[PDB]
Amino acid sequence: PSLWKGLVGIGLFALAHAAFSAAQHRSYMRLTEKEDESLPIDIVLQTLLAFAVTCYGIVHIAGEFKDMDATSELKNKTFDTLRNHPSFYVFNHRGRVLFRP
Amino acid sequence: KVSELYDVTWEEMRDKMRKWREENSRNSEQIVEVGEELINEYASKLGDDIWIIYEQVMIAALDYGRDDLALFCLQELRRQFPGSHRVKRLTGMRFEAMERYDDAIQLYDRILQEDPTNTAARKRKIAIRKAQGKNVEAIRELNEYL
Amino acid sequence: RVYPSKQFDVLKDDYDYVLISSVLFGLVFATMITKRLAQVKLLNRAWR
Amino acid sequence: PPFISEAAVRGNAAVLDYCRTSVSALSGATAGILGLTGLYGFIFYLLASVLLSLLLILKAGRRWNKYFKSRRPLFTGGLIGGLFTYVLFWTFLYGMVHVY
Amino acid sequence: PELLLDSNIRLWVVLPIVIITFFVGMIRHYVSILLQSDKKLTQEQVSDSQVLIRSRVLRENGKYIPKQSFLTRKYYFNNPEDGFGNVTNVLPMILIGGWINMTFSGFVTTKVPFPLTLRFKPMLQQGIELLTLDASWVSSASWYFLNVFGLRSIYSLILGQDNAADQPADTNKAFKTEWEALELTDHQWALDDVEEELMAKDLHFEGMFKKELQTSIF
């Protein structure tokens, strides 16, 4: 139902938070002038999890497939609705008499 | 009808009306019942979906022998769209639903004079011919139109 | 202090924030108005 | 099938394009965030693509022959524009984060 | 890395380019929709087009009717009948590019994350005046053009169908062409052995009496 929208929103928010955290960590590291290139593992895990969750959630809202067989939706069509022509309607019948003559 | 023998939202009613529109069903009573409520109690909820519902409900009410709702819908449609050609067709159908054929004929002739490549006016003239039992003339006019 | 290559590293001191904000707001307003006009034109063309 | 309807195939193509574009953009964004660079990062992109295809199978399930003639469009469909969007978002986010 | 950049340039030069190009594309799409065209056709044109479509449909699907009717229609159509706007689409792109080059060029914008060769350098560094700088660093105009080129899929996704971006003659001739094309078509009935195909297996009466008969609306 509508839970997939919440799931994808949560995933996007988590990805944005991970981005902000990585940027802040890089800005702090450039101050201390340390050439160790220390990337925390928790940030990588968080961003990978958020990306996976977001992709899984967004794959379920793109829509639904439909059969390509042209004779698939006419299995339930009946001749009652096929003989009605809206352009040639005429209002001269007993329906007027029955209801408030 | 909501909380009245049924429990459906306005979206469900809109979807049911759309489905009834896709396949040419002619159950006028149910269409009128749903449509009058949708027009009255949920007019503001529908942003731009009320004009096609107006047309459908007007046609159903004309089929149901209830002209007050038809006149109300026709007035609303004419106020919204001034000088349109579909509204003139609806007015002609309302005229011919009351056994006033000369006015409908002159209205359709005026429509054809304003626009020569219009199709609905010819079909309505053929319907007027058919309504009087003149089968041969209707067949000839339909053959010419085809 | 001297800059041989016209100081390609630091933003110029004569940046006009107000003009940027004005042009952004104008773009947004024009987008909204054009969207409304296009929608109304399509609706009116549908109903002849 | 002797008779084919164009509307269904065009709708399926639209759904596939939507999925491909969105997943390519998201993969580019996360690759930029991770700070990967060079051909190494390219590998990630391919991996992401594979993941997408796998999910499509779970979306198609069995009786996939009703929706598509073959799985080849489902696997190798749209690997040109997706790469461009991927590299664009990669550059954008890498400049936004690791630079400055 | 090699260079140290001011965060203010990132905050105030990068995002506005993207916002401007996005909304310019949206405005271009909406304006193009607003004054797309207004075309009118006379009755003879549409009548002849419908006749041509009918003839084409006959040629394509005459294999589903009895041969006598097909040849009766083929006797017809042979004796009696066949024989008796952009300025705003492109110019604003160049104008906006020039305006952006005028009011924004002069500093390093960003860097691509993959190595390149010297061939890339003349394209990505229009504004700067350095000589030995690497080709990965880009100027503002190159970033603007890259952003412009990398939004076709986004426009196709967030907006209906595809827009907001750059990329009969003679009735008698058509009549003669259709007359020549139809003359070499022959009837091939597709119902010769339908009965034998039907008789091969039992009818598929499975999954038809599920659910329940509908009682009322909803």
In this structure, which amino acid lies at residue A18?
A
DSSP notation for E9-78? HIIIIIHHHHHHHHHHHHHHHHHHHHT-------HHHHHHHHHHHHHHHHHHHGGGS-HHHHHHHHHTTT
Q: Whose CA is closest to A85, among B126, B91, D7?
A: B126
- The CA-atom distances, in angstroms, between E195 and each of B48, B124, E60, E198, E200 are 52, 44, 24, 5, 9
User: C touches B (3+ CB pairs < 8 Å)?
Assistant: yes
The residues, ordered by sequence, that sit 6+ positions from E12 with a Cβ below 8 Å of its Cβ are C11, C15, C17, C20
- CA dist D41 and D89 (Å) reads 13
Tell me how many residue pairs between chain A and chain B have CB atoms under 8 A apart: 44
The residues, ordered by sequence, that sit 6+ positions from B123 with a Cβ below 8 Å of its Cβ are A87, A88, B145
Q: Which two three-digit tokens encode residue B129?
A: 């011919």
Q: Which two three-digit tokens encode residue E140?
A: 């503002």
E83 burial level (CB within 10 Å; 0-12, 13-18, 19+): exposed
Contacts by residues D77-80 (CB-CB < 8 Å, ≥ 24 positions apart): D77/D16, D77/D20, D78/D16, D78/D17, D78/D20, D78/D21, D79/D49
The DSSP bridge partners found for residue E133 are: none
Which letter does DSSP use for residue E138 in this model? Answer: E
- CA dist A99 and D85 (Å) reads 64
Alpha helices, DSSP H only, in B23-100?
28-41, 50-63, 67-80, 85-97
Q: What are phi and psi of D11, to 5 degrees?
A: -65, -40
- CA dist D15 and D26 (Å) reads 17
Contacts by residues B112-119 (CB-CB < 8 Å, ≥ 24 positions apart): B114/B85, B115/B85, B116/E43, B117/E41, B117/E42, B117/E43, B117/E46, B118/B85
Chain B residues touching E217 at Cβ < 8 A: 6, 16, 30, 34
- CA dist A54 and D26 (Å) reads 9
Cβ atoms within 10 Å of B145's Cβ, excluding its own: 11
Inter-helix orientation angle E140-149/D81-97, to 10°: 140
Contacts by residues A51-54 (CB-CB < 8 Å, ≥ 24 positions apart): A51/A11, A51/A15, A51/D26, A51/D27, A51/D30, A52/D51, A53/A7, A53/A10, A53/A11, A53/A14, A54/A7, A54/A8, A54/A11, A54/A12, A54/A15, A54/D26
Owner of token pair 């990062």: D41
Contact: D5, A22; criterion CB under 8 Å = no
In this structure, which amino acid lies at residue A83?
R
Contact: C48, B51; criterion CB under 8 Å = no
Q: Whose CA is closest to D59, among E17, E92, A56, E124?
A: A56
Torsion of CA C35, C38, C40, C43, to 10 degrees: -130
Cβ atoms within 10 Å of D83's Cβ, excluding its own: 15
- CA dist B93 and B123 (Å) reads 11
Chain B residues touching C44 at Cβ < 8 A: 81
- CA dist E31 and E28 (Å) reads 5
Owner of token pair 């006149």: B71
Q: Whose CA is closest to E178, among E58, E1, E69?
A: E58
Contact: E46, B117; criterion CB under 8 Å = yes
- CA dist B86 and B111 (Å) reads 10
Contact: C47, B51; criterion CB under 8 Å = yes
- The CA-atom distances, in angstroms, between B78 and each of A21, B56, B64, C15, E77 are 60, 15, 21, 55, 45
The DSSP bridge partners found for residue D4 are: A69
Strands (E), E79-147: 110-111, 137-138
The residues, ordered by sequence, that sit 6+ positions from E6 with a Cβ below 8 Å of its Cβ are C9, C10, C11, D100
Chain A residues touching B55 at Cβ < 8 A: none
Q: Whose CA is closest to B77, among B64, B94, B63, B65?
A: B94
Q: What are phi and psi of E79, to 5 degrees?
A: -85, -60
Contact E210, E88 (CB under 8 A): no
To the nearest whole Å, the CA of E43 is away from the closest chain B CA by 6
The residues, ordered by sequence, that sit 6+ positions from D43 with a Cβ below 8 Å of its Cβ are none
Q: Which two three-digit tokens encode residue D94?
A: 């890498």
DSSP notation for C1-48? ---TT--SSS--TT--HHHHHHHHHHHHHHHHHHHHHHHHHHHHHHT-
The residues, ordered by sequence, that sit 6+ positions from D8 with a Cβ below 8 Å of its Cβ are A66, A67, A68, D67
Contact D88, E138 (CB under 8 A): no
Q: What are phi and psi of A91, to 5 degrees?
A: -105, 35
Q: Whose CA is closest to B90, among B102, B108, B106?
A: B108
Q: Whose CA is closest to E55, among E35, E37, E30, E80?
A: E80
The DSSP bridge partners found for residue E138 are: E110
Structure method: cryo-EM
- The CA-atom distances, in angstroms, between B37 and each of A70, A99, B42, B133 are 37, 20, 8, 37
Contacts by residues B73-77 (CB-CB < 8 Å, ≥ 24 positions apart): B73/B39, B77/B51
- CA dist E218 and A17 (Å) reads 46
- CA dist B79 and D62 (Å) reads 54
In this structure, which amino acid lies at residue E85?
G
Residue A81, chain B, CB below 8 Å: the answer is yes
User: C touches A (3+ CB pairs < 8 Å)?
Assistant: no
Q: Whose CA is closest to E98, among E152, E45, E140, E44?
A: E140
